[PDB]
Every structure is written in structure tokens, then in C-alpha cells.
Design a protein around this ligand. Structure first.
Ligand SMILES: Nc1ncnc2c1ncn2[C@@H]1O[C@H](COP(=O)(O)O)[C@@H](O)[C@H]1O
Ligand SMILES: [Mg+2]
Ligand SMILES: [Zn+2]
Length: 323
């Protein structure tokens, strides 16, 4: 309608408000934004992806995210895809990525938490869940998110990559898997350390554009870009960041309830009777989000200085909300 179109004017911008697009799209944010992103990039024409086939795949995919989960629903997927779309345009990365790589990073973002149950890998591992048994306690949710996303591409009416070459399907699949598995927070530190090393040896053209030699370097940046997009909520406007905070805290607190019922040890940050929503965000920004975005800012300087200023401002707002 007229409201959705106005909101989509900010499709290529960090200030896009995904909750508004959700309200104006019959509550199908992921389908909406994926279609918008794909048209915007000429990806359908480039990969001969049929419009019908693409829409059907996206609606089914959206349907497999759970609507009764506070945070890990289709809104978050849609947020990570849209933010990955903006990050792919950073001036410092101009013309560095093939269209297959661009295609893989946005697809990875869309499917990256599909069928999320609203509990963490640790919880699934400690309750001897079927998912943890299937996956041997290693990146349990992430392996599953990839398995569901690639499973939906198997049926004929839903295979959006059919017109890619065999070689292209193969290379995309390797990159996608790499990206979703990189969203597993137990790998954050190794990822952050490896990204710092890549900044140290950073090489550019006269145009202030990054020089990535081989595949290894390009996928290292995409891995990190998707991970930053996933941990991007504290970098968005404060009003958006606070909506995301309430949604994740709700999900974490419902996990502390499930744990207390089962008589398990309550995880302190998931404990609604003891944890501060305000301290949780400061600690999250100081030890995880800032160190990551600071390093990303260095890689693409000064393209992300605004995001970093906003992050610092949001961190200080949460700090002031602690007495
Ligand atoms: N606002 C937040 N406060 C605390 N932790 C967060 C917040 N946003 C993201 N995270 C963490 O980052 C992870 C990202 O992975 P995922 O939850 O699977 O989307 C979450 O599981 C949280 O542990
Ligand atoms: Mg995840
Ligand atoms: Zn996520």
C-alpha cells in the first residue's frame, strides 16, 4: 500500500524500520523484504529465478520460523537479510563480491534462524533433545537452520537455484553453510580474532576499496558481515534497539522458566528474578558488539563510523537506565 512503499524508500538504508514493513505486509516481513532486495539487485534476472518460484519458497521459509517465539521469528530473519543487504553496499566493498557471493550472503541471512525453537544450543544439549543428539552437540541450531533451508529447495516448485550451473549451486552451498555456521556464538571469538588479523594485513586500491586476493579472504568477510548483521540490533536507532531488546529478553526469560520447571540449573542471564535487562545490554555491548563493530569499522573505514557512534550512544542510554 502507500505506507509500505514509503517505508521501502529506506530499503538501502540502515534506518529502515522492519516492524513497520511487517505491519504493512500481512505480517510477512521476510517475504516482503526478500522480494524487495532481490528486485533492487536484479538478482532474479541475473540468476533466472522465476518470480513465482521465488515467492513460494520465501513464504514457505517464513512459515517455518515460529510466530510464537519472541525474538527468533521471521522479523529477525528479515532484519538480518535487510542489514546484510546494506552492508554489501558499503563503499569500501564496492565491486569486491561476485553476484553469486552477494546472492549467497542475502540467502544465508534469510534462512539463518529458520525453525528456531526459542531456546539456546546449551539448553538443547542439557535436556538431551533430539536436535542435540542428531548434531552431536556441535552448532546444533545452526546445522538445523541450514538443513531446513536447503531442504525446502529440494521440491521442484520451490527450487529457486535451478537455473544456476551445477558449479554455481555447489559454490553457493559451500558459502551459505559457512555463513550460517558462523552465526553460532561459540565461534564469535575465533571469528573476531581472525577478522582483526585481516585488518592488520588490509590492502586497498587508490579508490579506498578493499583488495581481497582469493575465495578464502572474500568468505572470511561475508562470514563476518552476516555475523555483524545478526548482532546489529544495538547499532540501530534507539527506538528500534529497545523493541529488539524486549523481544530477546522475553525469549531468554521464558527459557529460564522452562529451566526452573525442569529443576535444571538456571542460567543467570535467563533468570527473570535476578537479571537486569539494563546491565545485560551494557555487558553485551562492551564485551561482544562493540569489539566486533569496532573491528568491522576499521575494515571499512570510515563507512561505519555512524553505526559506531549510534552504538556508543545506545550503550550510554542503557547505562543511564541503571541507578
Ligand atoms: N539484545 C541482546 N542482548 C543480549 N544478547 C543478544 C542480544 N541480541 C543478540 N544477542 C545474542 O546474540 C545471539 C545471536 O544469535 P541468535 O540469537 O541465534 O539470533 C543471541 O542468541 C544472543 O545470545
Ligand atoms: Mg542463530
Ligand atoms: Zn540470528
Amino acid at each position: 500500500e502507500d505506507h509500505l512503499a514509503k517505508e521501502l524508500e529506506d530499503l538501502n538504508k540502515w534506518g529502515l524500520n522492519i516492524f513497520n514493513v511487517a505491519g504493512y505486509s500481512h505480517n510477512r516481513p521476510l517475504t516482503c523484504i526478500m522480494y524487495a532486495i532481490f528486485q533492487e539487485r536484479d538478482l532474479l534476472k541475473t540468476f533466472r529465478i522465476s518470480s513465482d518460484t521465488f515467492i513460494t519458497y520465501m513464504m514457505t521459509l517464513e512459515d517455518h520460523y515460529h510466530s510464537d517465539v519472541a525474538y527468533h521469528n521471521s522479523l529477525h530473519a528479515a532484519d538480518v537479510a535487510q542489514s546484510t543487504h546494506v552492508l554489501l553496499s558499503t563503499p569500501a566493498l564496492d565491486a569486491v563480491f561476485t553476484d553469486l557471493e552477494i546472492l549467497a550472503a542475502i540467502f544465508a541471512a534469510a534462512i539463518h534462524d529458520v525453525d528456531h525453537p526459542g531456546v539456546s544450543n546449551q539448553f538443547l544439549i542439557n535436556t538431551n533433545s533430539e536436535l542435540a543428539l542428531m548434531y552431536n552437540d556441535e552448532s546444533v541450531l545452526e546445522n538445523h537452520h541450514l538443513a531446513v533451508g536447503f531442504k525446502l529447495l529440494q521440491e521442484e516448485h520451490c527450487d529457486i537455484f535451478m537455473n544456476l550451473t551445477k558449479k554455481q549451486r555447489q559454490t553457493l552451498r559451500k558459502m551459505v553453510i559457512d555463513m550460517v555456521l558462523a552465526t553460532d556464538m561459540s565461534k564469535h571469538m575465533s571469528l573476531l580474532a581472525d577478522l582483526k588479523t585481516m585488518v592488520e594485513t588490509k590492502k586497498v586500491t587508490s579508490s579506498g576499496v578493499l583488495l581481497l586476493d582469493n575465495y578464502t579472504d572474500r568468505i572470511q568477510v561475508l562470514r563476518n558481515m552476516v555475523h555483524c548483521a545478526d548482532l546489529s540490533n544495538p547499532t540501530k536507532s534507539l527506538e528500534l534497539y529497545r523493541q529488539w531488546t524486549d523481544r530477546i529478553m522475553e525469549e531468554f526469560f521464558q527459557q529460564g522458566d522452562k529451566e526452573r520447571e525442569r529443576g535444571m540449573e538456571i542460567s543467570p542471564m535467563c533468570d527473570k528474578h535476578t537479571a537486569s535487562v539494563e546491565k545485560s545490554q551494557v555487558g553485551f555491548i562492551d564485551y561482544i558488539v562493540h569489539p566486533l563493530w569496532e573491528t568491522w569499522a576499521d575494515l571499512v573505514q570510515p563507512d561505519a563510523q555512524d553505526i559506531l557512534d549510534t552504538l556508543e550512544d545506545n550503550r550510554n542510554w542503557y547505562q543511564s537506565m541503571i541507578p
